[PDB]
Amino acid sequence: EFRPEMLQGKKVIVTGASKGIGREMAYHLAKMGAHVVVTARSKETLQKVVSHCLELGAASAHYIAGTMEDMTFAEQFVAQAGKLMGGLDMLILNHITNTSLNLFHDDIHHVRKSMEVNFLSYVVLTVAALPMLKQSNGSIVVVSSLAGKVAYPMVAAYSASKFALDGFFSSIRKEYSVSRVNVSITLCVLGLIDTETAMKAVSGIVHMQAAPKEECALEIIKGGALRQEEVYYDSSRWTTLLIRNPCRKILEELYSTSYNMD
Amino acid sequence: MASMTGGQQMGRGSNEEFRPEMLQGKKVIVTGASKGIGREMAYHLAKMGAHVVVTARSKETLQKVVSHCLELGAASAHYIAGTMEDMTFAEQFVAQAGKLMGGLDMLILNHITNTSLNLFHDDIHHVRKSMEVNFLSYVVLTVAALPMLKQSNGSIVVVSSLAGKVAYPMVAAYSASKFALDGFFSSIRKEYSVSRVNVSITLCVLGLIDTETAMKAVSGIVHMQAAPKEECALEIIKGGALRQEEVYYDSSRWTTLLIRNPCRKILEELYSTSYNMDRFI
Numbered sequence: 001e002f003r004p005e006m007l008q009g010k011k012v013i014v015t016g017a018s019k020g021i022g023r024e025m026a027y028h029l030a031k032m033g034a035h036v037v038v039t040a041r042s043k044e045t046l047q048k049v050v051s052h053c054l055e056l057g058a059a060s061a062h063y064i065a066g067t068m069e070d071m072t073f074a075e076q077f078v079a080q081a082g083k084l085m086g087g088l089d090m091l092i093l094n095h096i097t098n099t100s101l102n103l104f105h106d107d108i109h110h111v112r113k114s115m116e117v118n119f120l121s122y123v124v125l126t127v128a129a130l131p132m133l134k135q136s137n138g139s140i141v142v143v144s145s146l147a148g149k150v151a152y153p154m155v156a157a158y159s160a161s162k163f164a165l166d167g168f169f170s171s172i173r174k175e176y177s178v179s180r181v182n183v184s185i186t187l188c189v190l191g192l193i194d195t196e197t198a199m200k201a202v203s204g205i206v207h208m209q210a211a212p213k214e215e216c217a218l219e220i221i222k223g224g225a226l227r228q229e230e231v232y233y234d235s236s237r238w239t240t241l242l243i244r245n246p247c248r249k250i251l252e253e254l255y256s257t258s259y260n261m262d
Numbered sequence: 263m264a265s266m267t268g269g270q271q272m273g274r275g276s277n278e279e280f281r282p283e284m285l286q287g288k289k290v291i292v293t294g295a296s297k298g299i300g301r302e303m304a305y306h307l308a309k310m311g312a313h314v315v316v317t318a319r320s321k322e323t324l325q326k327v328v329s330h331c332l333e334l335g336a337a338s339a340h341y342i343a344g345t346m347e348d349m350t351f352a353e354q355f356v357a358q359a360g361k362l363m364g365g366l367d368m369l370i371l372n373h374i375t376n377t378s379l380n381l382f383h384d385d386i387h388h389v390r391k392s393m394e395v396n397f398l399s400y401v402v403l404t405v406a407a408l409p410m411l412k413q414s415n416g417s418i419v420v421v422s423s424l425a426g427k428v429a430y431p432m433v434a435a436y437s438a439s440k441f442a443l444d445g446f447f448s449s450i451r452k453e454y455s456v457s458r459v460n461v462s463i464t465l466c467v468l469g470l471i472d473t474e475t476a477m478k479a480v481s482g483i484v485h486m487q488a489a490p491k492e493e494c495a496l497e498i499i500k501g502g503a504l505r506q507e508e509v510y511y512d513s514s515r516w517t518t519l520l521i522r523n524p525c526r527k528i529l530e531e532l533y534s535t536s537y538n539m540d541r542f543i
């Protein structure tokens with residue numbers, strides 16, 4: 001059972017926090033009295049988010065602006081965020097590259113950029129954060145999608161990047177378990193959320209009910225605080241009924257007997 | 263005689279019962295075909311009388327595969343050597359392979375970057391290279407091949423793994439690349455359905471196979487039963503020929519019982535009615 005006091009005084013990074021779900025997570029963490037470091041490219045918007053976090057009751061709030069297309073920025077950002085807070089308890093990986101609903105034809109540049117921003121930068125940030133998270137027995141929270149568990153047309157590049165996060169982070173979760181690395185990994189499987197970006201992108205194409213961004217942001221934080229392996233959040237009860245894959249969990253357990261990781 | 267012959271191999275029961283004559287005279291590309299499963303696929307295709315174009319980096323080993331394909335009965339066999347780390351090579355390779363055969367019926371995407379079993383710590387270079395070679399080059403090859411495959415109502419065959427459907431430790435970079443193939447190719451399969459692109463996409467989910475590379479890599483770390491490479495290679499070809507969406511091949515009857523995900527198929531069908539793609543069609 002989650003309690004908001006679980007975030008009180010915790011040192012948290014939130015990426016993609018100038019708008020949508022990321023901004024809502026920064027606001028919830030501020031209300032809970034966490035220390036926050038927010039990032040995105042928009043310095044001016046991040047200044048406004050930080051000012052608001054301080055008004056809401058954050059223990060401290062800072063922003064560092066930059067692009068996650070730059071792997072050197074991603075690595076340096078974590079070191080600076082850790083230096084500002086004097087450590088790190090939770091790393092919330094939420095940013096994505098700008099995308100739109102379109103059939104795939106020949107835009108390899110978009111496929112590669114989606115893989116670099118939505119996936120590879122999450123790996124770089126994790127590698128940079130791990131020493132601090134090992135010190136605090138901390139948590140990594142990876143924001144994904146229903147399009148990271150099942151297939152959807154018009155989002156091929158985006159879906160490939162979200163599926164990649166599952167393969168990568170679920171593999172390292174198994175490694176951390178056997179290697180006694182006490183850092184939790186929470187994969188958040190979200191359905192359609194009413195962010196301005198998503199609502200504009202889907203307009204006239206997708207008619208699904210969108211879930212509220214404020215509640216979505218809180219469910220992600222709860223999942224991370226509770227060290228849950230997966231969070232599922234969607235407007236539909238049929239989606240919630242069908243999304244889990246118990247057979248995958250059974251197979252992984254059956255194959256666990258076949259290792260010597262010494 | 264060929265000019266006085268016509269007809270179709272794919273009649274009643276051809277979506278469920280394979281015959282080697284289904285590959286007779288078909289124009290096929292096999293990547294990663296100098297060794298392991300790819301080499302075995304080139305040999306099966308040769309025995310079936312297909313036209314083959316094989317690729318890998320090793321000019322000398324590909325030379326030997328081509329020579330054996332011709333001995334086995336291939337209608338024609340050629341190789342083009344190069345690295346799939348080079349996206350210009352991948353794009354140009356498909357154009358040259360198509361020119362050699364006078365078209366393309368099946369694109370078998372099988373190559374991977376050299377890897378090993380290790381805990382992940384900080385090798386970002388291996389993560390990026392795995393994504394470039396095992397995933398991005400497959401997309402480049404598909405884009406280059408699609409005009410020819412649309413002309414022949416052809417097939418794309420994507421070689422994946424159980425580590426592309428469930429999580430496994432010690433193969434994080436590799437697993438991320440295989441999961442990426444599922445998300446990408448399964449999304450475009452849905453797009454081709456609505457856009458009336460008659461090109462099938464077969465995702466092959468393979469368990470441990472007795473290739474020299476895999477057997478060396480798992481030695482003393484993974485104690486699992488390995489399935490035979492020759493039978494594996496034939497099951498991949500059969501799935502592609504029958505235009506199956508997925509092929510599952512593993513030594514364990516338990517894996518084959520549990521690997522399918524009916525809930526994912528149900529959800530996708532429920533969401534299939536959730537859109538209006540009329541501006542794209």
Ligand SMILES: NC(=O)c1ccc[n+]([C@@H]2O[C@H](COP(=O)([O-])OP(=O)(O)OC[C@H]3O[C@@H](n4cnc5c(N)ncnc54)[C@H](OP(=O)(O)O)[C@@H]3O)[C@@H](O)[C@H]2O)c1
Nearest residue numbers: 016017018019020021040041042068145192193195197198
């Ligand atoms: N909205 C939905 O329906 C939905 C559904 C499922 C999952 N999700 C997941 O939820 C997360 C947030 O989605 P959202 O709808 O809140 O998106 P959003 O409102 O568009 O926000 C995207 C955030 O990422 C930042 N960003 C974009 N390019 C960047 C780059 N190169 N470097 C660093 N930051 C960058 C943006 O700020 P700047 O432009 O200032 O950099 C912004 O802060 C994503 O992981 C997404 O996949 C959303």
Ligand SMILES: NC(=O)c1ccc[n+]([C@@H]2O[C@H](COP(=O)([O-])OP(=O)(O)OC[C@H]3O[C@@H](n4cnc5c(N)ncnc54)[C@H](OP(=O)(O)O)[C@@H]3O)[C@@H](O)[C@H]2O)c1
Nearest residue numbers: 294295296297298299318319320345346423471473475476
């Ligand atoms: N064996 C298994 O247990 C197993 C299990 C599940 C799935 N699979 C899948 O089966 C497929 C074949 O695996 P395998 O065991 O047969 O592999 P393998 O015997 O190691 O063969 C790898 C092939 O890819 C080529 N290759 C390597 N690097 C390349 C590069 N940069 N550019 C172009 N070609 C390159 C290799 O030749 P060069 O070095 O001469 O380029 C060789 O022809 C892979 O998709 C694998 O993921 C295998």
Ligand SMILES: N#Cc1ncccc1CSc1nc(O)c(C#N)c2c1COCC2
Nearest residue numbers: 099100145146147190191192197198201
């Ligand atoms: N374009 C765009 C865009 N903008 C903001 C966030 C995500 C995106 C990517 S579109 C997208 N992203 C998802 O995660 C889901 C789910 N579940 C869905 C879509 C669109 O189709 C409905 C379901």
Ligand SMILES: N#Cc1ncccc1CSc1nc(O)c(C#N)c2c1COCC2
Nearest residue numbers: 377378423424425468469470475476479
């Ligand atoms: N290293 C290596 C190497 N060499 C050849 C092919 C694949 C690889 C990558 S290791 C690898 N590849 C897979 O696809 C599976 C499955 N299922 C498994 C392993 C290793 O653990 C057992 C399961």
